[PDB]
Design a protein around this ligand. Structure first.
Ligand code: HEM
Ligand code: HEM
Ligand SMILES: Cc1cc(N)nc2cc(-c3ccc(OCC4CC4)c(CN)c3)ccc12
Ligand SMILES: Cc1cc(N)nc2cc(-c3ccc(OCC4CC4)c(CN)c3)ccc12
Ligand SMILES: C[C@H](O)[C@H](O)[C@H]1CNc2nc(N)[nH]c(=O)c2N1
Ligand SMILES: C[C@H](O)[C@H](O)[C@H]1CNc2nc(N)[nH]c(=O)c2N1
Ligand SMILES: [Cl-]
Ligand SMILES: [Cl-]
Ligand SMILES: [Gd]
Ligand SMILES: [Gd]
Ligand SMILES: [Gd]
Ligand SMILES: [Zn+2]
Lengths: 401, 401
């Protein structure tokens, strides 16, 4: 069992939970690939059995009559139909466990507080849209954000998948141009082109909210516009740099990832969007300052009258700090939930301690947990971590086009 | 052959050099341990033969002549004596190779410029001190720092080892009180008490340069006072914050690590101190702002009149950036070589590109290459990296007690 040291304090623990690692990652004794972004009834039964054991452990019914009854029933259903169905309480437990198990999520202190919307009866792309609208309305909650997931019907033999083609429920268009440059968010060029190809009339601003492309089983994707009053946005201003507001920058309240696959007990839910609230560095550092995103850093540094001709003036660091200040100030001014990277990493340290007592460890991806600015100023920098894959899980999946 | 992507540009390479990894790292298919600081004879001829082959490859002299001849003499030398002696040019080539192979070093663009002092004919703690003194004066060079390594004799069976007991050649003392808590550097509390427990009369200050504990084979260590004239230091001032100088902070010019073991062709040099020049974050972010180092961040924020009552003011980030500015400004004013983290990481990306075409890849430890502040503002953040062990190498070794 791997020994894990915290170098700030001197703490030492042993991750016994990693021995239960359900699947295999990309590393070998020869070479570590930890930094890479992208790392049959008998085996369905084996996964289902393990999940049922997890569930009956959680409700203190391990080895009970009800437990073996459920195991037998799942066995029988897989034999009769090639698959099985989760009970409502099992689905809620499995979705929370998937969040709990997500190695790259720093917000997991919240994992037990998750609103689970059961849309497994969804029949069409039109009903899917209605479920998604109510997810956005519930989770946004006029700025007092609430964590939620909506889970659409599972993958099943004989029918195609439900899929949301968008990577998030709220995204800004990226318009390719000539001179070659992108207007708007360069991360979203491909989905923007698909929306146009599917009949969307594009705008030409830098912050145009994309329509949704929703795919029902064995059907082409269908375009749905989000009511503007459902999409809460925050104009960005800085508390002391008054010219900052003239940049015309905005970001949206609700981070709602919609392109990942939820796996519970061998069953797969290719459409299950989930949302929480933002950590400010995701917006201020990555979305606004990445060179391949909005890339505002030099324009902000010039406006700040910093010396951008030499790197040792640390103009990049100074400008990025004030952009993050602007994000926090603006969301707080707008009364939209947001967490700075210091509070978030401190709460993640408490989660690690909670999980060491509860389960004997915690899967965590150091390079994703450590924030993209001020890394060693946060306590997670000094915490050794062990990365591994537990199920139930959120998994990446290929784009449906 | 692992596929490696840069996410800022979109470019892809394959690391074919990984296929040559020798020592097994700590990771397995089921769990990654990349964030851990410490990863948990006819064998001599195999490592010597391999290293000799490396040497003659690098000079286009594989496949006959002195290559064939050098192979037999190491064979005979080991057959006769059980060990072997490196030629001077091999010691030079091997030292540069171990530096080139160091996965955690961001300064490897410089790997070809290394001054190798051959101290293999040393045989007393008195000779060591003269060697270490030659190195420090040469490497310091009045502030125009020059990369250098001094190689004391290779370990051999039956006799003790040459070892430097200090982790670096220049370190600051750390002293306790009625309350354990430290005046000085907490990293060096252990060696401070060893030095005092060997004759050294302690100082009173927060920046007392420690003496050297030098260990000739099979003898107790011997204290040596470094000539103050030979330890170049930089008082810390800020370009616009007039009071920063009054904080009384200083740091030294030369980073010279002295507790690592140099391994070349199966031979082991437990005493082989190497030096370069600092990257400014090492001083300003880690040494001065780590909570378990000088922990000055709140003191600087009070002086800047920052609101330390809420994390979301980003007072930690602001104070940290100004400390790093003060380090860079002070070292440049003192005309002591230093490199900021933007310049250093940009050079490492050029190094990665050079190594791709020369050797087919480059062992790199993402968590150590990405700097401890402003990570995603540097290009290395967006570069996937592959970590593995090649020989020659610098290795960690246990403390000599
Ligand atoms: C409640 C507030 C939350 C915060 C502050 C938060 C924070 C974060 C952050 C900063 C990341 C890294 C993303 C990036 O760098 O681009 C992340 C990743 C992730 N989050 Fe959370 N999150 C929250 C809620 C949730 C919820 C409710 C779920 C699911 C139910 C979730 C699941 C995930 C997953 C699956 C990933 C990355 C996938 C992986 O591990 O490979 N998060 N989160
Ligand atoms: C010339 C300028 C150099 C710079 C700017 C530089 C910078 C750095 C930095 C920032 C680290 C990270 C360590 C930490 O953050 O605590 C490092 C590690 C390291 N450096 Fe360099 N360094 C330089 C020269 C050298 C030289 C000359 C050698 C040896 C001949 C060397 C060998 C190493 C080793 C062995 C490590 C630890 C790496 C590992 O364990 O894989 N460096 N360096
Ligand atoms: C619920 C939630 C809240 C939050 N506050 N943040 C979140 C960030 C991500 C996330 C996941 C993966 C990912 O990247 C995947 C790689 C592009 C394929 C990114 C973008 N870095 C963000 C996912 C969910 C989040
Ligand atoms: C030549 C050189 C230049 C430089 N500019 N920097 C350097 C930093 C280290 C180094 C290596 C390992 C290490 O960590 C060991 C762990 C504490 C036991 C630390 C301290 N973090 C520094 C080693 C050499 C360096
Ligand atoms: C190549 C590198 O793994 C990549 O840029 C990662 C690093 N760490 C990250 N960490 C978070 N939270 N989000 C990210 O997108 C990334 N990107
Ligand atoms: C736990 C973690 O591995 C540890 O804090 C590492 C992270 N990255 C680092 N990177 C550098 N350059 N130096 C360090 O000491 C560390 N410390
Ligand atoms: Cl985002
Ligand atoms: Cl140091
Ligand atoms: Gd102002
Ligand atoms: Gd402008
Ligand atoms: Gd004052
Ligand atoms: Zn690994």
């Amino acid at each position: 069992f791997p020994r894990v040291k915290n170098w700030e304090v001197g703490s030492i623990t042993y991750d016994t939970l990693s021995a239960q690692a359900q699947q295999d990652g990309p590393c070998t004794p020869r070479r570590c690939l930890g930094s890479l972004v992208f790392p049959a009834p008998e085996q369905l039964l084996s996964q289902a059995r393990d999940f049922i054991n997890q569930y009956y452990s959680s409700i203190k019914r391990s080895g009970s009559q009800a437990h073996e009854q459920r195991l037998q029933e799942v066995e029988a259903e897989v034999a009769a139909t090639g698959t099985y169905q989760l009970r409502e309480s099992e689905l809620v437990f499995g979705a929370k466990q998937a969040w709990r198990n997500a190695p790259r999520c720093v917000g997991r202190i919240q994992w037990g507080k998750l609103q689970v919307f059961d849309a497994r009866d969804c029949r069409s792309a039109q009903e899917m849209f209605t479920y998604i609208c109510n997810h956005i309305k519930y989770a946004t909650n006029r700025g007092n954000l609430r964590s939620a997931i909506t889970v659409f019907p599972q993958r099943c033999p004989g029918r195609g998948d439900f899929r949301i083609w968008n990577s998030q429920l709220v995204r800004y268009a990226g318009y390719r141009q000539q001179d070659g440059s992108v207007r708007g968010d360069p991360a979203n060029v491909e989905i923007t082109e698909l929306c146009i190809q599917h009949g969307w009339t594009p705008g030409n601003g830098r912050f145009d909210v994309l329509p949704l492309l929703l795919q029902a089983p064995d059907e082409p994707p269908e375009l749905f516009l989000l009511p503007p009053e459902l999409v809460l946005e925050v104009p960005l201003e800085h508390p002391t740099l008054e010219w900052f507001a003239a940049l015309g920058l905005r970001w949206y309240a609700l981070p709602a990832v919609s392109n990942m696959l939820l796996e519970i007990g061998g069953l797969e839910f290719p459409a299950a969007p989930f949302s929480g609230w933002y950590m400010s560095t995701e917006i201020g550092t990555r979305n606004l300052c990445d060179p391949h995103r909005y890339n505002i850093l030099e324009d902000v540094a010039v406006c700040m009258d910093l010396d951008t001709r030499t790197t040792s003036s640390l103009w990049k660091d100074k400008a990025a700090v004030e952009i993050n200040v602007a994000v926090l100030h603006s969301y707080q001014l707008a009364k939209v939930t947001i967490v700075d990277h210091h509070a978030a990493t401190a709460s993640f340290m408490k989660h690690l301690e909670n999980e060491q007592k509860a389960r004997g460890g915690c899967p965590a991806d150091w390079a994703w947990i450590v924030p993209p600015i001020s890394g060693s100023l946060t306590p997670v920098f000094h915490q050794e971590m062990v990365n591994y894959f537990l199920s139930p899980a959120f998994r990446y999946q290929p784009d449906p086009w």
